[PDB]
Subunit: 159 residues, 3 copies
């Protein structure tokens, strides 16, 4: 059980290190063949689309994905859990916070290896206006947010 | 091997990591009951010279926090010494805040913890947050520097003043 | 077992951040091997004496947090190579800001039952639109401190090949 927790930590680390090094093949490889990444409600399903998403991401983003606060429950070859996500971005005005939120994950151990079946990212909203996109409020950041959202719209479907 | 004494200490460390994660994930989803449940029944949280003691006051603090904050508490760099059913350690705290101007850093500092294991579960007996200050003017609270940020800081310090008591040192 | 080594490496990474962030330069240099090195911004600082001096210079001008997360290490006996994410906050008169965002690229060695850093390179994240730009000096509040850190590196280290 403890070893599985360390394996899941390693998976989360590889998810960040692959996307942050523009390794879209490796990023998609963190998911099951038919796995999904959901953000801002758009569900991007399957390695082919996931790889396209990472490629689009690579064109417009440099920064760090930080995954911390990992809390997973494992039963046999399935696990679910949550973790905190903070994403930085390199801008001409310095390093800014592109994203802050929570991953909600369903993981599957298939033939020896943990992979992401479903990862939902929920980004934090204003307490007083859960309609406002906080990630577009700063202008440097806003253009990048636009590109990522556009990629999700071209590659996913909204539920 | 096998499992040796220090190996057992590492399994306790993973358990403590999970407690730290729970602490963050509960407050960040406005689960004040879950948050207070990370502490012992007479556990305390200290920040800025104020100590909030006991689950009921801790629950009220979380509820006050929920009214004014959306953001993430990140806890990283965990380093704990386990001695049977007690542990002491430190970890890094960075706290983000969703603002009308974008995501900002609300807080940065260190947790200094005293933990107790009861009924097979680790909980926080005492957690002290020390926030990072200006090297040049350590009197200044750095949280109050940005105006969005500063209002949230004021609300949290007010909750602490209503729910806690001032430290003796 | 490989997994206990990973936890030990995690604790070394934690110690690195907690020492520097509490102005414990001896402690910080003690995370490295005796002739271990730290590389950043094209400068390499080598050996505990110089690393201690670096940490002391750092303490004079920085208050903030080094976060290390996303740790991924390959352990082969008493050596390991790996990567982790670095985000560094800084207390400024305009609030907390991000001083650094990048990747640590590490070569670790285990001796006397303890892992230490033989070589750590910090590679900060670059602008996609212009890799020549030093993003850590784009914000004036942050650049002020970077300048002091680079002065210490210039005094204590050697430029890379």
């Amino acid at each position: 059980q403890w070893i599985e927790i360390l394996r899941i930590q390693a998976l989360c680390a590889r998810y960040c290190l692959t996307i942050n090094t523009q390794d879209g093949e490796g990023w998609a490889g963190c998911f099951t063949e038919d796995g999904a990444f959901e953000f801002d409600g758009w569900v991007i399903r399957g390695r082919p689309a996931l790889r396209e998403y990472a490629d689009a991401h690579a064109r417009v983003v440099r920064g760090r994905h930080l995954t911390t606060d990992l809390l997973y429950e494992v039963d046999g070859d399935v696990a679910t859990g949550r973790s905190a996500s903070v994403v930085t971005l390199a801008t001409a005005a310095g390093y800014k916070i592109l994203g802050s939120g929570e991953y909600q994950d369903r993981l599957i151990k298939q033939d020896g290896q943990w992979r992401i079946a479903y990862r939902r990212l929920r980004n934090d909203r204003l307490v007083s206006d859960p309609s406002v996109a906080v990630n577009v409020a700063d202008a440097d950041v806003a253009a990048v947010v636009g590109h990522l959202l556009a990629a999700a719209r071209r590659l996913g479907t909204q539920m």
